[PDB]
């Protein structure tokens, strides 16, 4: 099959590994997997579009971690935004000064 | 003595409804609303500074929001066979709008 070759990307192989890191024996169906895939795509497009507006407002043609930080501070409500900004900052600081 | 002319509670009410529906000026006083905006802003960031047009835009949006909320509150009051709005009506309007979150 060389003409039947079109691989649609997803987030199944990642959300499965995050689930095994959180609950080491709990599984998940494929319908709930598609709901988690649509959730990741939804929140991705929300934060990307909000950061694109936050770049266009300040006449800047570059998205960095600061626009994503303030987009997370706008879109996520309450303590969820604070924990997501803490986790994001910790991951960026771990990423920059690594091997 | 029957000299001082006094109206009914359903005359001056409808007269001021017709008066304040045909008007476009702001109804909340500007300086107490500005002090309220500054007080609410002091919790998020210290040593802020407002443009006058920003406070006027906040006042336009907040008065339009409250007039729309009192329209749905009036519909909730009439639906319960009453002409008196109550906090039940404001809670029902903000529940049906989906703003109890």
């Amino acid at each position: 099959k060389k003409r039947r070759k079109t691989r649609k990307e997803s987030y199944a192989i990642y959300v499965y590994k995050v689930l095994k890191q959180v609950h080491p024996d709990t599984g998940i169906s494929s319908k709930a997997m598609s709901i988690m895939n649509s959730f990741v795509n939804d929140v991705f497009e929300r934060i990307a579009g909000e950061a694109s507006r936050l770049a266009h407002y300040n006449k800047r043609s570059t998205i960095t971690s600061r626009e994503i930080q303030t987009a997370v501070r706008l879109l996520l409500p309450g303590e969820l935004a604070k924990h997501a900004v803490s986790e994001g900052t910790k991951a960026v600081t771990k990423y920059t000064s690594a091997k | 003595v029957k000299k001082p002319h006094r109206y009914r509670p359903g005359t001056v009410a409808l007269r001021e409804i017709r008066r304040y529906q045909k008007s476009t000026e702001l109804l909340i006083r500007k300086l107490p609303f500005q002090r309220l905006v500054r007080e609410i802003a002091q919790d998020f960031k210290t040593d802020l500074r407002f443009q006058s047009s920003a406070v006027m835009a906040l006042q336009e949006a907040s008065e339009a929001y409250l007039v729309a909320l009192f329209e749905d509150t009036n519909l909730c009051a009439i639906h319960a066979k009453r002409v008196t709005i109550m906090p039940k009506d404001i809670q029902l309007a903000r529940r049906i709008r989906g703003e109890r979150a």
């Binding site: 959180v22 709990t26 599984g27 319908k31 709930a32 409500p77 309450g78 | -």
Partner: protein
């Protein structure tokens, strides 16, 4: 969702578990207010006026 699955005596997350997981949390319900999850249903939440009075008169 793993806590909602463990409550339901299941070791596999069905969309009912994601529905109960998001809608019971208040910040995730604020995040996904205008969002429908397929094969979810709704929360088992009955109002306190539609129930018959299962009480006893003190007098």
């Amino acid at each position: 969702a793993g806590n909602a699955a463990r409550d339901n005596k299941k070791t596999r997350i069905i969309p009912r578990h994601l529905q109960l997981a998001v809608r019971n949390d208040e910040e995730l319900n604020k995040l996904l207010g205008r969002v429908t999850i397929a094969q979810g249903g709704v929360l088992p939440n009955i109002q306190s006026v539609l129930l018959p009075k299962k009480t006893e008169s003190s007098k």
